[PDB]
Design a protein around this ligand. Structure first.
Ligand SMILES: NS(=O)(=O)c1ccc(Cc2ccc([N+](=O)[O-])cc2)cc1
Ligand SMILES: NS(=O)(=O)c1ccc(Cc2ccc([N+](=O)[O-])cc2)cc1
Ligand SMILES: [Zn+2]
Length: 258
């Protein structure tokens, strides 16, 4: 067996193999907008994706990852709440079986249809595997998806999904520009948290954008045609691959905006 999002191995079971699941800085969380405090000391986010080099897309059995060449300082996240330079390694999404659920973070208990995670590692730790062992090792930029108008910059991702239907399939995926997945505004909330999948390491500075992007119903329907299973195994649609909100405990969520 293995962890997953099924009836028998979903989020409420993860603690049995990953006891940090019940830890002090777990993610995602509900963002209570009225209690989040505006912090005028927070800087604008600096997103520098002009030279980003995508390489490949992978169905890993839990989601799909669009992977980047992180061997040089290209595609970096700086500023905001962060000290230093964080390099983009991959992005992926979490989504629902229906448009009314799918996000990991919630906003005043509102669930979005999906949530995009742009994952970055702190260059002071040299590579990703070392960074996840540090409390300031990662910065994950989270972006909500709502269903409405299509996101033109998402379509190249949607169209390659047919070629990675099942667990363990990958496809070449070069020249994809992740700037096409951003909203207009970079206003954000931030808090200290964790990976949202096992091993659930408490190594993430979360930066969650206030403004969702709009994707079309047809775009998200194509996410829901993916499979958790491998080729030749009983079909299990890749849907509801989100962890619910976890206790905030002794944390403060800060807002970059009034
Ligand atoms: N703690 S965990 O890594 O999430 C984990 C959870 C459950 C199990 C056992 C398991 C039992 C049944 C199924 N199942 O029917 O698909 C899948 C897994 C094994 C491991
Ligand atoms: N969903 S999320 O919090 O943005 C997230 C981002 C990246 C990862 C990837 C990952 C991170 C760490 C390990 N690990 O230490 O074995 C394995 C995979 C896992 C989860
Ligand atoms: Zn994620």
């Amino acid at each position: 067996h293995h962890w997953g999002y099924g009836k028998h191995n979903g989020p409420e079971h993860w603690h049995k193999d990953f006891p940090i699941a019940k830890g002090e800085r777990q993610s995602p969380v509900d963002i209570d907008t009225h209690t989040a405090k505006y912090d005028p000391s927070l800087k604008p986010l600096s997103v520098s994706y002009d030279q980003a080099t995508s390489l490949r897309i992978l169905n890993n059995g839990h989601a799909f990852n669009v992977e980047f060449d992180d061997s040089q300082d290209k595609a970096v996240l700086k500023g905001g709440p962060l000290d230093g330079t964080y390099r983009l390694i991959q992005f992926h999404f979490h989504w629902g079986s229906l448009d009314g659920q799918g996000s990991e973070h919630t906003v005043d208990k509102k669930k979005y249809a999906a949530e995009l995670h742009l994952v970055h590692w702190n260059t002071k730790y040299g590579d990703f595997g070392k960074a996840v062992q540090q409390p300031d090792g990662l910065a994950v930029l989270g972006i909500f998806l709502k269903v409405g108008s299509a996101k033109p910059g998402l379509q190249k991702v949607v169209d390659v999904l047919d070629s990675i239907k099942t667990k363990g399939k990958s496809a070449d995926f070069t020249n994809f520009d992740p700037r096409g997945l951003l909203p207009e505004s970079l206003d954000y909330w931030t808090y200290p948290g964790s990976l949202t999948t096992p091993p659930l390491l408490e190594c993430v500075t979360w930066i969650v954008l206030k403004e969702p992007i709009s994707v079309s119903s047809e775009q998200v329907l194509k996410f829901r045609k993916l499979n958790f299973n491998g080729e030749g195994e009983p079909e299990e649609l890749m849907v509801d691959n989100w962890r619910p909100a976890q206790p905030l405990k002794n944390r403060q969520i800060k807002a970059s905006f009034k």
